[PDB]
From a paper:
Here, we show that [name] [name] is an outer membrane, TonB-dependent transporter that is conserved in many Proteobacteria and which mediates acquisition of both reduced and oxidised ionic copper via an unprecedented CxxxM-HxM metal binding site.
One strong anomalous peak, at the high-affinity binding site, is observed with Cu(II), supporting the SEC data that the histidine is not required for Cu(II) binding. All 4 residues in the [name] binding site contribute to copper binding, but not to the same extent and, in some cases, not equally for both copper redox states.
Residue numbers in the entry: 67 to 443, 453 to 723
The structure:
Amino acid sequence: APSVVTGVAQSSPLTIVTNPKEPRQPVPASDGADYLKTIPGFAVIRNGGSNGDPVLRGMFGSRLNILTNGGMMLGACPNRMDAPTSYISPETYDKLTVIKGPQTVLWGPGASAGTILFEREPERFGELGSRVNASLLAGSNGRFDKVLDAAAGNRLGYLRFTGNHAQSDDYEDGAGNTVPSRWKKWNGDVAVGWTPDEDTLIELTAGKGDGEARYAGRGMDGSQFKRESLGLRFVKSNVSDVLEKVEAQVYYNYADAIMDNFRLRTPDPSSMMPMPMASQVDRRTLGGRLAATWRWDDFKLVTGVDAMRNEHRARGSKYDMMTDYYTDADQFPWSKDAVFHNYGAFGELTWFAAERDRLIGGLRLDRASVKDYRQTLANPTANDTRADTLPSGFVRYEHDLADSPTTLYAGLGHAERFPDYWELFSPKRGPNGSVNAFDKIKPEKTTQLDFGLQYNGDKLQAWASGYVGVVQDFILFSYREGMMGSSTQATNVDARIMGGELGASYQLTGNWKTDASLAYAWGKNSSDDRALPQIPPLEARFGLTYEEGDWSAGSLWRVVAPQNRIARDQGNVVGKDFDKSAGFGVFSLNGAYRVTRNVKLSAGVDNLFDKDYTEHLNKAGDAGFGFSANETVPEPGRTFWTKVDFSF
Ligand SMILES: [Cu+2]
């Protein structure tokens, strides 16, 4: 029976696995963050119509470790207008995996909050054959998506093409105002795979993508988000009796971004930027991974190394005051400001004691350097390099109850994250006493305890996952004051965090089903005896479902508490806290019909009751567009969408 997705269970301890090709009930804006909105734990900062910044249990930014096909794609805007999830079209992947908390060491450094894994799976052709999947979505406000996934091959290897094109106009809020929010996005990507015998795979991949998006939050819109990307991966299997797998992969991703104030808006003569202005930035990322999995019937061991160089450059437009001329950014040389390296080694080990007891541990050690290539701002850290060695690891114990189909789990984790591009270069001020941020921001050290349970019964599925943690040298942003616009200062503080997520799924009759989910996050700034900023409020979802093995309808109610813990004028590189937030409820409806084996119809109405509201985390709306300099960007009002999936 064909459904429409509205939440995801925790399928295993701390681990959520979904297929991002299923329709989702608050229809996602064709980016990475909106596909995480359905998973309890995740909030999204809103910037406009798309390209939100994702947040997991209140943690922001590089604390989330988002990988696409094992590789890592970093954007270039100093103010994270193109966060790593903005280059992702989840409709083109096949699997989405979320691992909550510092509880894997297999996928790179600094995963304090969690790991997110969008991946393509290799084809499985036997005889000579072909396969086409395609989808079309029309919705309110000029929403149109077009998605294609096609492949061909036999048992010796395959060609696969995936690609999408998606766009929408400005949406409107619960009060009929239109919000600066149009966007456009395309992606094209090729993969060639060689399977010379059943144990061997060599796959080669490349693609490009591009997009634009109007940003209600910011003083500039994204007129270009160019992506060029390349990858190679080698996998052998059954190398020996113990050696079960050897994986090597190299990835190259390149981001090339243009933000300006004149292509998607007109400059605004009251603001700090009253003339046409364009900012061009790029980000070149090269990395790879080598890994061996060993298996001997009571133990599994995975050992590997991984590396990563990333480079960052900028160049602006000019504008002559006495001529009204305007020279563009591409008429000038790129100016490097930062290069980052990381090398790491890792080991993860599982013990299958009995069949109701499981022990997992992992360790990883990291060498992480950054060089500051800025010559001026003169620059007291010009051409300075700095590094650190960061041990990280975790232990998880899982035990199944002999009685019921219940699983309990507890785990302890410790993660050290080196500061990222935004934490060292983007803040105009560093800590009191510092020459700048690059010199003094210390790495972040998180120590967290994760616990929860699973119940998979006949009519009743349920899961919970809680966390408690301290964070030493949490990298906090303080906007505090303005002097020519708002300027930030990065600092290090100690903090306490705690929260959890739970959910439940009950089968009423054979056709009727209802589910629920709750998500909480709490955070204290222990160094200053106040709350942590940018924490989302407690939130709850209720769904009702009718399936008749041919077609289904669904109802959804999202209920969100107010947030009364705020730390005004503090936050991250993207947003600051200003006001306690109002709660709200939003109701939604969906159906689905299987027309034939190949053609599946879906449709929904989002926010049926046209609620006027704003999430706590959304950006502070511009004021060049009519906002009171602090009101946050409003969520869309009533919206309809319809989608056809065909798989011939
Ligand atoms: Cu920008």
